[PDB]
Design a protein around this ligand. Sequence first.
Ligand code: GDD
Length: 365
Amino acid sequence: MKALILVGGFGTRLRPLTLSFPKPLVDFANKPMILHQIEALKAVGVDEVVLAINYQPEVMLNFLKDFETKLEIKITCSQETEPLGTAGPLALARDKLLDGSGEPFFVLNSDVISEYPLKEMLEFHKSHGGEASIMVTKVDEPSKYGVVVMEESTGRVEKFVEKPLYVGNKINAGIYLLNPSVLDKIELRPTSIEKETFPKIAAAQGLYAMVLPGFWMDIGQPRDYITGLRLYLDSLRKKSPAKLTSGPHIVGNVLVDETATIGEGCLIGPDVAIGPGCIVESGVRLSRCTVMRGVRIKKHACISSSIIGWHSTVGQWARIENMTILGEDVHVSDEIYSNGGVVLPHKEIKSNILKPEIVMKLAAA
Ligand SMILES: Nc1nc2c(ncn2[C@@H]2O[C@H](COP(=O)(O)OP(=O)(O)O[C@H]3O[C@H](CO)[C@@H](O)[C@H](O)[C@@H]3O)[C@@H](O)[C@H]2O)c(=O)[nH]1
């Protein structure tokens, strides 16, 4: 059984984090983004995973090479030449997805986080004997996504419309399970899976949708990255609560790597992820933030609703809030305030950053 992960490019919308590591390698909840999906694929018996990418794969071959041996799984890159769309790279990796076993393959959107009930999706797939299965989840604004109108009891989808006028409340969750026959409806040309391939399969009465249990989020923009960690950590509390840390210094759900250190007098939480090798000194306040590998938060600093990149340094009594994104190896001096700062890697912040909402929503004029 095979799987393909639609990655895309390096990730412009996630700068300055993606100036150091490509989109699938950026840490989410203390492990590289791509590992959340590769681990879920291995759990259901996938033996090879193809990364449909846009860039030179040498930059991430060192990362995957250890995870290949560690997870006992094969990872190959399928770099495209020209923009092939969302169904194009499915045909560019036709030789890698079809081994002759006749078994279906998974297709995952790399920007999507969920619980991945792939085992239940596999038995759902065999039950209806259809050509393609897709996961669906409800949202409040089904207009920024692609609505899947479907019939109950069977799950057969009736149409796959994109950028719709309320046509339904279920949307494509970016988790596909496709039979080998799907690859016959895709040419080796730029083609869109949501506009062409899925409507065809629905017309042939062979497209089925399964309601996705649990959380779902498309972490494209860093604002959704903060919301994504909250939903993930809530899922972790329900499935395996012992993986979250607790104590008098903890409020809500906090995920601390085993090699991180927390000094006395801290107040960490809610919705905080502290990466490996981190040093949180005394009297630090962290909330709704991601602290990546190897950063140091000095005494009495207060970080909220922000993302501190790898190997950054936050000075004593520094105050970081309101979606501040620090790149790799950013040094924030003592007693500095940052509101909405977006700092390129390796920079030293010696002056305050003042980009509040009232400031930005007033500079429009
Ligand atoms: N190999 C390759 N990958 C691409 C390309 N274009 C986009 N991708 C990647 O495929 C994924 C889909 O991203 P978009 O093309 O921007 O579509 P979308 O607006 O985000 O919406 C789609 O995803 C939602 C999440 O499941 C769906 O809800 C929605 O229905 C739709 O399928 C992303 O990870 C993107 O990097 C391409 O030309 N080639």
